[PDB]
Amino acid sequence: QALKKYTIDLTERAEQGKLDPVIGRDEEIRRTIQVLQRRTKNNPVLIGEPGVGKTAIVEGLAQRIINGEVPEGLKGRRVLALDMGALVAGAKYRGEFEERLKGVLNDLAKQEGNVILFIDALHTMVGAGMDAGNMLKPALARGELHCVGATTLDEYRQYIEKDAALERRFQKVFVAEPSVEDTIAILRGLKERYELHHHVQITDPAIVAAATLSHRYIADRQLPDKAIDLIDEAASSIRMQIDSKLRNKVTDAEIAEVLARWTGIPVSRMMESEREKLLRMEQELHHRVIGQNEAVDAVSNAIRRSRAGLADPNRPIGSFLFLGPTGVGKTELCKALANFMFDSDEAMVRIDMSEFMEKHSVSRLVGAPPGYVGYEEGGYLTEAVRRRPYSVILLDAVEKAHPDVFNILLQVLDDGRLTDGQGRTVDFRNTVVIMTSNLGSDLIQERFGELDYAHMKELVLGVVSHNFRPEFINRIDEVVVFHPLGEQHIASIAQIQLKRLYKRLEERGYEIHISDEALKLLSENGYDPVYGARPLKRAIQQQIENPLAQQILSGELVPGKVIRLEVNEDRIVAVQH
Amino acid sequence: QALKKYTIDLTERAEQGKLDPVIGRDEEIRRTIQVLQRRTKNNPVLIGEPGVGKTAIVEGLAQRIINGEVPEGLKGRRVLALDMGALVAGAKYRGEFEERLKGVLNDLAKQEGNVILFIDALHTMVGAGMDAGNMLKPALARGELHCVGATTLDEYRQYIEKDAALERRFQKVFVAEPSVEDTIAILRGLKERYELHHHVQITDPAIVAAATLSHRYIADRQLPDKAIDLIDEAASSIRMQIDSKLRNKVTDAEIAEVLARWTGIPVSRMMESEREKLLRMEQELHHRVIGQNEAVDAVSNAIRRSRAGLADPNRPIGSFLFLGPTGVGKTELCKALANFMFDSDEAMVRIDMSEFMEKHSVSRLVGAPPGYVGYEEGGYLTEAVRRRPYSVILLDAVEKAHPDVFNILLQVLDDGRLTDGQGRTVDFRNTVVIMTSNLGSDLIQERFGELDYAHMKELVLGVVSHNFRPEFINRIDEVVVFHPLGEQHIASIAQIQLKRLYKRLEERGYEIHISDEALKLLSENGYDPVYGARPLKRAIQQQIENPLAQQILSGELVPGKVIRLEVNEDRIVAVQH
Amino acid sequence: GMDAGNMLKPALARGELHCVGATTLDEYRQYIEKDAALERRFQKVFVAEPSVEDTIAILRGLKERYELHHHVQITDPAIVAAATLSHRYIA
Amino acid sequence: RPYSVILLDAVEKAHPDVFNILLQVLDDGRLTDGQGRTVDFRNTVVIMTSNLGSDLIQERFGELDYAHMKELVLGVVSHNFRPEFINRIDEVVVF
Numbered sequence A, B: 001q002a003l004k005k006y007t008i009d010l011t012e013r014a015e016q017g018k019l020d021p022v023i024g025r026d027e028e029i030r031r032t033i034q035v036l037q038r039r040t041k042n043n044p045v046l047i048g049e050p051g052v053g054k055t056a057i058v059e060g061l062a063q064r065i066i067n068g069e070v071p072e073g074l075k076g077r078r079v080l081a082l083d084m085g086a087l088v089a090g091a092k093y094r095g096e097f098e099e100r101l102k103g104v105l106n107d108l109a110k111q112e113g114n115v116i117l118f119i120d121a122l123h124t125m126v127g128a129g130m131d132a133g134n135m136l137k138p139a140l141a142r143g144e145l146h147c148v149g150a151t152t153l154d155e156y157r158q159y160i161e162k163d164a165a166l167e168r169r170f171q172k173v174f175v176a177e178p179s180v181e182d183t184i185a186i187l188r189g190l191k192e193r194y195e196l197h198h199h200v201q202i203t204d205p206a207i208v209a210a211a212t213l214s215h216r217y218i219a220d221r222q223l224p225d226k227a228i229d230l231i232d233e234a235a236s237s238i239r240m241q242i243d244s245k246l247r248n249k250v251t252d253a254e255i256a257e258v259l260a261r262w263t264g265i266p267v268s269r270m271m272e273s274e275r276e277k278l279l280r281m282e283q284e285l286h287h288r289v290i291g292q293n294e295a296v297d298a299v300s301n302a303i304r305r306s307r308a309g310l311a312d313p314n315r316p317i318g319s320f321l322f323l324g325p326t327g328v329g330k331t332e333l334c335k336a337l338a339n340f341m342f343d344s345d346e347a348m349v350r351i352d353m354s355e356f357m358e359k360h361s362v363s364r365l366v367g368a369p370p371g372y373v374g375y376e377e378g379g380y381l382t383e384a385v386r387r388r389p390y391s392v393i394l395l396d397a398v399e400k401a402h403p404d405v406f407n408i409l410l411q412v413l414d415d416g417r418l419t420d421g422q423g424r425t426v427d428f429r430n431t432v433v434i435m436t437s438n439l440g441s442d443l444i445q446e447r448f449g450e451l452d453y454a455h456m457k458e459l460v461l462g463v464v465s466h467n468f469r470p471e472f473i474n475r476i477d478e479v480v481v482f483h484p485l486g487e488q489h490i491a492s493i494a495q496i497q498l499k500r501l502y503k504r505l506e507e508r509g510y511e512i513h514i515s516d517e518a519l520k521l522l523s524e525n526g527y528d529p530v531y532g533a534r535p536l537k538r539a540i541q542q543q544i545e546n547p548l549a550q551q552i553l554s555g556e557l558v559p560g561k562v563i564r565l566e567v568n569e570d571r572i573v574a575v576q577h
Numbered sequence C: 001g002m003d004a005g006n007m008l009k010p011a012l013a014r015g016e017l018h019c020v021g022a023t024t025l026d027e028y029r030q031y032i033e034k035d036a037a038l039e040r041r042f043q044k045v046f047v048a049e050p051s052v053e054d055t056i057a058i059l060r061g062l063k064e065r066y067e068l069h070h071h072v073q074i075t076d077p078a079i080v081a082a083a084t085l086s087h088r089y090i091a
Numbered sequence D: 001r002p003y004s005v006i007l008l009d010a011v012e013k014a015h016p017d018v019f020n021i022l023l024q025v026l027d028d029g030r031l032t033d034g035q036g037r038t039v040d041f042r043n044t045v046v047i048m049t050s051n052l053g054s055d056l057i058q059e060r061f062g063e064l065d066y067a068h069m070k071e072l073v074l075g076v077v078s079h080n081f082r083p084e085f086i087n088r089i090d091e092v093v094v095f
């Protein structure tokens, strides 16, 4: 016979107990029993995006047939898993696959309607040699074959809904992804099975945490399989930490460590080390951003409102409109924010809006529509956020952008979603959009003297109201205003540049000190109201990197010696003492 | 049993010491024990480059099993390599090989999970013509086999990531290339094994030299395999030098001899030092370009200052300004610098920047937005850099463009990067940027005498300071002065062309010489104050070759005559003596 | 034709065989660089296509061979011209 | 037939990746096909036509020389083509 060859018995395996005792799913199984008890077209196909457990539905049906919870037309059935891969094995000759398939069909006709077939990956049945649909297809029509498909919706619309007769043979039992409490019940049955597997124990707050956070963070896989993967690798981690040298109980700290190994996101709560960071988040950000207190207050309040569960699950973490003097640390607050937010000065997406001066540049930023040249790789913003969900976007110099781009940002800052050219949505609810401009720079550099921050923000917000449309400036979470710098802040910037210079040259091997008079000459040589601290940057770079490295590479200076940077009338001389 | 017939044990070999104690890769073995102790996804397939010892990871796993360095789920587990040889041999009949693998899987089902299978070349078992692999998918589906695979990433993404059951019965183990010191420790253990084997000796500075020379040069083979090949074939070379016509230690000079005898062929004197390589870089730059050492040594000084690394590595390497006469050797200097510096002449990007004056022209030097014209061409300025990661960019006629292109160039000299129209990062921090103009063409062509390199440099530096941006000369490391040609350049280039012509005629069988007066006539027929060498090229070609090839195909010239290229009254004739 | 390879592939992976191979780089790149049990039993010996003068000496030995065969005479300028014209023209 | 005459007639119409193919030709004389191997082009006369200097020559070939005409139409083709392509020509003769 061929049923022993090519078909696997499920009801024997559910009778031995070698399957998942899946909990729930009763409405899909009731619809499958509706379809399997018809007269013609007895052919359900289970359509779901992967991971929703369609194999689990058919095996739960097999378990109900064994236990006897089925109507009086399914008692005694044998559910058989046909293998479409195991039939195209030796078919290298002519008419050899047809021998196997018709042997299977004659055996299933000889069984006299007591066998429910189950073709997992039903899209494989289309091409297996015309060829493989076109032998089953009258048996699927006349209802004598009680086939049960199990497919994915993308594969269904690609393979089967192009072939119309095979599409009308089957019946769609549309399977949705289960909820989080349903996933909890699933993981309770599997908690019994896993605690009998590893000889470990599992705690139910870890189960509800794993299911909820796996719905929250991993949007790539689907529930419940990603949750089961979390639970099982947590169990294996505990099982190896038993014999790597002491628990037997899995808690959600282990789930957080496993999920950090998966995706890297700060899933863990306050461990009283990053909480001391977050309570002094302002004092943290003043290690790199000296002064500019109001916006540091606002942005650290935005992150502290995000981490505390007070974050709105529709809007992003925060929109921001940076104004003020041109170029002081817009970029420095942004890069230090990316540093103390997730990693470093590299997990940001900078988009210079001065490039975006026409509408086809807006086509660049969103993406090309179908039937156009750059359709196949999408836009620039939305591809960047699909790469980097947990990031900070820096739209830089938004005043040079054509005002239509603010409509893209209307969508962005309304609901955290933006649809690119290829017809897909991007979630912005894990980003911090920050937009910089200079639409009040002369006014803020002039009338800052003894005018408070509130009325200054009011007046420059009126200016921006004359600039933009009211629709967009309603969407801004908080406009903040940078104030102009002072000379002690210039001294602080010079101290930070001397610290990184001493770090680089101590990694090189030198020990260099400086006089305070040289720092005063740098503060003289590095400021204007119209540019700010980039004159200080180029002044430090010219007056240090050019003469001192020339003195070092002249075979003159020795590593290890104290190199006191003495001053000159116009320059900086170095000594070996 | 077929366990002794079609499986090869590895635990017996490590028990009897018939394997090799592979050092390192602790994290991968730990994650493999994580994956092998689950209930789902229980089959890790090792994924890495060819020649990285994934089978060595399995051997170290089996050594930890035998020695007892495994958790309490692997003590008592055997590791059996499935014999691809006799099995893939026996694939003649439809029932001969199938019976073999059937009996093998019946034996593995009889072992009841107590025995772990090993399979190498997993894609070969998947693609074999249930031909081979879906004979095992009814076992790996039902969970009666806990085997471990090994394949390359391309075969895993094509043959396994495409499939549906096969994608989920397997797990990724992402092995990469080992580090330098890991290779050092592995080669120390193999030094012990080889000095016990070949009865020769191996030097440990020769080991770290072999690792460095292997990682720098051999690109196809990877670590550890190329280093092991160097060490052991050098040991065989020392063994042959015992019976050559003494020595027992494998020294680093022997490693350099093996490296030269392989397909890399370096000079070992080139691999002695980097500063001697800088001095020979200078000397070979004074070979293809004859005379005029000032700008060449200035570029050499700038290159040594960049390779000293005392400046910012967030900027590109080179920033010069070749001025004066156009096309007389700026191209040749760029080709010689790119040749002797990194690899060859193809590290050049010669772009006439007089083209990009319109707005969409500026869009084409970054790339067209998605859905539009020049998108598939690329950005024309970054596309040559992405393919040439260590290039020398030659911007010709940079002053004849739009000022925002100069802003883009300042962004290049600032950040060392530029995002193209296709939406990715293009790094510029390893290239040599050279821009040219003609502000000092006649300033040098009329004042070649009585003015040295420094005063002409200060004069044309004042000229460029009057003409161009202040930020333009801020970012140039040295505004150099490219030299006008002398007559020794003319004589050198003309004699090189005569050398290749005399080589081709000697291959035909003609020995021809030239008088000095004919070289004077060529120098007068080739020289012009704006072009120089290439009118000399076409003048040499015409005035020599065309009457000569008229005469050779006239039956006039016979090989075996002293042929001096004498002169006419004002022309050049070939005579026979 | 088990036939000739996959019985000798156990001789690879059993520590007995001392074989020497030779093939085209085409079938090397297409058939030999793929197999797993065939990698760590072999080693690339890149045979160089010979130079001019080595070809000249080989042709002088075979000049003796062919003058013994055809009962004609072969000139050595014709040999060096044959090797040079073959290298210059035929690809 | 390795000794032949190849007329790539009116080459300016085609797509610029074909000019990448011909850069391979003029660089080496060997060209990889789809099967994989390479074919020697070092005995053929690869001739190309165009008309990219049409109105330029029908305007200015009168009362001008021949050399600066070649220079000016070389500038026109430098607007059209790539500089490596006009670099790797033996000689661009202009009608």
Ligand SMILES: Nc1ncnc2c1ncn2[C@@H]1O[C@H](COP(=O)(O)OP(=O)(O)OP(O)(O)=S)[C@@H](O)[C@H]1O
Residues within 6 Å of the ligand: A020, A021, A022, A023, A024, A025, A049, A050, A051, A052, A053, A054, A055, A056, A057, A151, A152, A186, A224, A225, A228, B040, B164, B168
């Ligand atoms: N109701 C359920 N109860 C218990 N486990 C379930 C349930 N539904 C799904 N699962 C688990 O989900 C995992 C795989 O689910 P499946 O439904 O088999 O995925 P799938 O239907 O095969 O989708 P693809 O495309 O074939 S991967 C297994 O670990 C099942 O145990």
Ligand SMILES: Nc1ncnc2c1ncn2[C@@H]1O[C@H](COP(=O)(O)OP(=O)(O)O)[C@@H](O)[C@H]1O
Residues within 6 Å of the ligand: A288, A289, A290, A291, A292, A325, A326, A327, A328, A329, A330, A331, A332, A436, A492, A493, A496, A532, A533, A534, A537
């Ligand atoms: N608060 C600060 N602390 C330390 N350095 C800063 C601070 N603010 C500005 N800088 C320096 O000022 C410069 C301003 O550059 P940037 O932020 O790009 O200009 P813009 O203000 O136009 O965004 C930066 O290069 C940075 O090094």
Ligand SMILES: Nc1ncnc2c1ncn2[C@@H]1O[C@H](COP(=O)(O)OP(=O)(O)O)[C@@H](O)[C@H]1O
Residues within 6 Å of the ligand: B020, B021, B022, B023, B024, B048, B049, B050, B051, B052, B053, B054, B055, B056, B057, B186, B190, B224, B225, B228, C040
């Ligand atoms: N830790 C190690 N110690 C010694 N030799 C090793 C080690 N890792 C790999 N090798 C060498 O690598 C070769 C095995 O190749 P392998 O790693 O199985 O191929 P792949 O690189 O495709 O996985 C053996 O010759 C072995 O000597």
